[PDB]
């Protein structure tokens, strides 16, 4: 591993504080601006939609990425949630109520087994099964996010290959002729310190770069900065143009 | 089917001639600037990498999207071909010599049987590693849409896995506004030299299938495949 504090320029420039952690899959080498923070475990928040998706698919609570999850009819803050969703849009728009229902159907017992199987964070689901990833006992650090994602990428998790492909599909965030980003955003607000997450990978023609970042996010104004700071780091490291 | 000749302005711009065909999935309605050309058949050229990929995957000729097909050491015209490839990059760079080997490994019996199962155009394969480039196989833009629609819905006669991996390999462009999975072609071995772009645009709420071809008298206009298609897509408010 290497610590590169020059990345703090990209944080400070965006009026921000946080960590980005990079994993170069070909060379098996890691880079971060803050070794301590890289290992600090926080609530996964909506980054939990990755393991949650895999388990629901594998257990058949979600048939496929086309099954419609109708709106519960309760108007919420984020207009984008106030509508019917499939897996692709629910991840795209980070649709909490949809996933709480998945957790409710999966159940405490099947959820615990699955997370032990995944070696995911502290594998703690204390709280209710329907929101422990927002305000329960589950904690995961940046480096643990990377370890889990490398297993996903390589179809190595103990759920079906199909479930893995489907979630990787739902993870698609950005692509062009230079790179493909598969990733998931998160925003933990219910327990201090409030933090945003962006975790996933960048696929290049002959290599894959895994990332997991988080940053202090005391207000929902700064959410766009998760991607912006990450991109500035990826540019600096010559991974993207 | 609706004809919309106002789309010709996007071809006119560049002294280009050709067709864009669109299919609105929610609506089960299609649109095109030229109904006649929409139904004319041409060599698929590299758009055939889609069904070739499905066939190679289903038969185990290709293990997965990570398997490396080492370069054969013979330098070829197109610089991106002169290196090692997997299914992702062999598709992205339309790496003919990779796909010719797939087709030689598939064989004429199983290719011909697969193409009939697929209802793929005229299905016209002793032409095994080249029929899609200079053989008798022909497909129209409208037939491209029908084939793509089955692939989209995993309706084809290959595994779900194989369909999913090819759709992954088709990924071309993605935004917060849209996802394009597609495949280019460029047919120069038989007249008329033409360019193709076929695939679909994934939105939150809908999917829009497309298939375009155009006269390509020189390679200087290859950018126009995607460029003219996007102009039509923006006119139809499909993408901002």
> How does strand A29-32 pair with strand A2-3?
parallel
The whole-angstrom separation of Cα B134 and Cα B44 is 10
The whole-angstrom separation of Cα A86 and Cα A151 is 25
Structure tokens at A193: 């310190």
Q: Is A46 a catalytic residue?
A: yes
CB of A30 closer than 8 Å to CB of A22: yes
Structure tokens at B81: 């071909």
The whole-angstrom separation of Cα A3 and Cα A169 is 32
Structure tokens at A203: 């696929």
- For A11, counting Cβ atoms within 10 Å of its Cβ (0-12 exposed, 13-18 middle, 19+ buried), the class is buried
3-state helix, strand, coil in chain B (%, to 5): 40, 20, 40
B155 interaction partners in chain A (CB closer than 8 Å)? none
CB of B219 closer than 8 Å to CB of B77: no
Topology of domain B1-240, per CATH?
Beta-lactamase (3.40.710)
CB of B148 closer than 8 Å to CB of B198: yes
- The DSSP string of A105-169 is HH-HHHHHHHHHHHT-TT----S-TTTHHHHSS--B-HHHHHHHHHHHHTT-SSS-HHHHHHHHH
CB of B57 closer than 8 Å to CB of B166: yes
Question: At a CB cut-off of 8 Å and minimum separation 6, what does A190 contact?
Answer: A43, A134, A135
Structure tokens at B63: 């293990």
CB of A142 closer than 8 Å to CB of A212: yes
Q: Cβ A161–B165 below 8 Å, yes or no?
A: no
Question: At a CB cut-off of 8 Å and minimum separation 6, what does B230 contact?
Answer: B239
Among residues B84, B123, B131, B74, the alpha carbon closest in space to that of B103 is found at B131
Assess B174–A contact: CB distance below 8 Å, yes or no: yes
| Interface mutation target, options B173, B174, B203, B227, chain A, most CBs of A under 10 Å | B174
- For A97, counting Cβ atoms within 10 Å of its Cβ (0-12 exposed, 13-18 middle, 19+ buried), the class is middle
Please, which contacts does B168-173 make with residues 24 or more away whose CB atoms are closer than 8 Å?
Answer: B168/A165, B168/A168, B168/A169, B168/B65, B168/B88, B169/B53, B169/B65, B169/B87, B169/B88, B169/B91, B170/B50, B170/B91, B170/B199, B171/A172, B171/A175, B171/A180, B172/A175, B172/B199, B173/A175, B173/A176
Q: Half-sphere exposure (CA, 13 Å, Cβ side) for B36? A: 3
Experimental method: X-ray
- For A155, counting Cβ atoms within 10 Å of its Cβ (0-12 exposed, 13-18 middle, 19+ buried), the class is middle
Q: Resolution, in Å, please?
A: 1.9
CA nearest B153 in A: which residue? A66
H or E segment and range at residue B88: helix B87-92
Catalytic pick among A46, A53, A141, A163: A46
The whole-angstrom separation of Cα B46 and Cα B44 is 6
Neighbours of B73 (CB within 10 A): 6
B160 interaction partners in chain A (CB closer than 8 Å)? 162
Topology of domain A1-241, per CATH?
Beta-lactamase (3.40.710)
CA nearest A89 in B: which residue? B204
Collapse the DSSP code of A31 into the 3-class scheme (helix H, G, I; strand E, B; otherwise coil) and give the result. strand
3-state secondary structure B100-164: HHHHHHHCHHHHHHHHHHHCCCCCCCCCCCCHHHHCCCCEEHHHHHHHHHHHHCCCCCCCHHHHH
The whole-angstrom separation of Cα B95 and Cα A223 is 40
Q: Residues 88..107 of A with a Cβ closer than 8 Å to B: which?
A: 88-89, 92
């Amino acid at each position: 591993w290497q610590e590169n504090k020059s990345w703090n320029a990209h944080f400070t420039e965006h009026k921000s504080q946080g960590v980005v952690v990079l994993w170069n899959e070909n060379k098996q080498q890691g880079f971060t601006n803050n070794l301590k923070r890289a290992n600090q475990a926080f609530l996964p928040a909506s980054t939990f939609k990755i393991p949650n998706s895999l388990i629901a698919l594998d257990l058949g609570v979600v048939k496929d990425e086309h099954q419609v999850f109708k709106w519960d009819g309760q108007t919420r803050d984020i207009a984008t949630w106030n509508r019917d969703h499939n897996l692709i849009t629910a991840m795209k728009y980070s649709v909490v109520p949809v996933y709480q229902e998945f957790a409710r159907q999966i159940g405490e017992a099947r959820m615990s087994k699955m997370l032990h199987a995944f070696d995911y964070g502290n594998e703690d689901i204390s709280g209710n099964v329907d929101s422990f990833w927002l305000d329960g006992g589950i904690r995961i650090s940046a480096t643990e996010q990377i370890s889990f994602l490398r297993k996903l990428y390589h179809n190595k998790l103990h759920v079906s290959e199909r479930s893995q492909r489907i979630v990787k599909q739902a993870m698609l965030t950005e692509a062009n002729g230079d790179y493909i980003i598969r990733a998931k955003t998160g925003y933990s607000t219910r327990i201090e310190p409030k933090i945003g997450w962006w975790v996933g990978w960048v696929e290049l023609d002959d290599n894959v770069w895994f990332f997991a970042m988080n940053m202090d996010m005391p207000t929902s104004d700064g959410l766009g900065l998760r991607q912006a700071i990450t991109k500035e780091v990826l540019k600096q490291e010559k991974i993207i143009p």
